[PDB]
Design a protein around this ligand. Sequence first.
Ligand SMILES: NC(=O)c1ccc[n+]([C@@H]2O[C@H](COP(=O)([O-])OP(=O)(O)OC[C@H]3O[C@@H](n4cnc5c(N)ncnc54)[C@H](OP(=O)(O)O)[C@@H]3O)[C@@H](O)[C@H]2O)c1
Ligand SMILES: CC(C)(C)n1nc(-c2cccc(O)c2)c2c(N)ncnc21
Ligand SMILES: CC(C)(C)n1nc(-c2cccc(O)c2)c2c(N)ncnc21
Ligand SMILES: N[C@@H](CCC(=O)N[C@@H](CS)C(=O)NCC(=O)O)C(=O)O
Length: 275
Amino acid sequence: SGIHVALVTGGNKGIGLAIVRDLCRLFSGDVVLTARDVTRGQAAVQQLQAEGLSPRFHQLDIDDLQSIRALRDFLRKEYGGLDVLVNNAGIAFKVADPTPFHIQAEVTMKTNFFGTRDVCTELLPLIKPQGRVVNVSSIMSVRALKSCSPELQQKFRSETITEEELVGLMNKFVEDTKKGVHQKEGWPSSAYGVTKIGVTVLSRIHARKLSEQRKGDKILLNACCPGWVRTDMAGPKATKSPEEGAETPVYLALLPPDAEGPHGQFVSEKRVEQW
Ligand SMILES: NC(=O)c1ccc[n+]([C@@H]2O[C@H](COP(=O)([O-])OP(=O)(O)OC[C@H]3O[C@@H](n4cnc5c(N)ncnc54)[C@H](OP(=O)(O)O)[C@@H]3O)[C@@H](O)[C@H]2O)c1
Ligand SMILES: CC(C)(C)n1nc(-c2cccc(O)c2)c2c(N)ncnc21
Ligand SMILES: CC(C)(C)n1nc(-c2cccc(O)c2)c2c(N)ncnc21
Ligand SMILES: N[C@@H](CCC(=O)N[C@@H](CS)C(=O)NCC(=O)O)C(=O)O
């Protein structure tokens, strides 16, 4: 059939850029680097061109629904869909940030959970058979899960939870921080960690829906942690290079055709972790 296409969100720097670079070399088709800032995105494309690579570019800010929709329309028009989607874009307040916690919660949740969700709402319908979806979560999601109340752990581990139930819970965390009741209500103290619970559970729900609604289509969807990577997020003391951080996401993006799994798993260092 037609030309295959892979796309990475937050592709202008850090792990996203390393993922783009690797897909340029390893993905059999076009690779679209996306970035919210057009200047930074184009600069990244130029960087890869100087390395001998040929990524395409399209603007994308996962917090602007019009930007997501424009990208959706582009993919439909130019490719008739999408083969690989890497939801890499994410943010985190610094450990030392004095920003009031409730603002940290609202802002981090807005991008990491709601932005990622919005991208999936518009782009999952475009995924072609044998496609792969990779959601970059964090081992912090596993850590944060342990600090939730037993009641919340049960909900987050549920095999029957719906996307709309999860949306309610994520917004509940944010609202609870605003009311000064998040601890009493069973939430952990890491806003970032809770947003990544959101990403992990969203992955589990979307994998279920793919298996239930698109049987036979051979689509695999997983959450992952890239490990601790030297980027503008984690800082210079981290143990992995962006190259090393890209290995697990690229692995999940390029699972060979007809492969049975992993599917709906949380993967770290190419290995399935218990949720
Ligand atoms: N140790 C680690 O570094 C580590 C570990 C586990 C998980 N992660 C996860 O790995 C992913 C990549 O992080 P990183 O370490 O590479 O961080 P980074 O260097 O800060 O890069 C983050 C990328 O996401 C983009 N982004 C942020 N908000 C966006 C938005 N609203 N719309 C579109 N793009 C947006 C950023 O664009 P700008 O350049 O415009 O800001 C940048 O391209 C994140 O999801 C992070 O949570 C990182
Ligand atoms: C073997 C892969 C495809 C992973 N790879 N990686 C790299 C590579 C090497 C150093 C840094 C980097 O980001 C990527 C590479 C290269 N330069 N030439 C040919 N193949 C390369
Ligand atoms: C700060 C420590 C070293 C605890 N850290 N931070 C992170 C980390 C840093 C930035 C983002 C993230 O999701 C996690 C991390 C990791 N992924 N794996 C192991 N250790 C990690
Ligand atoms: N108070 C924040 C802490 C978030 C956090 O742990 N940030 C880490 C990455 S996940 C970070 O920015 N580390 C680098 C640094 O602080 O220099 C929250 O609750 O979300």
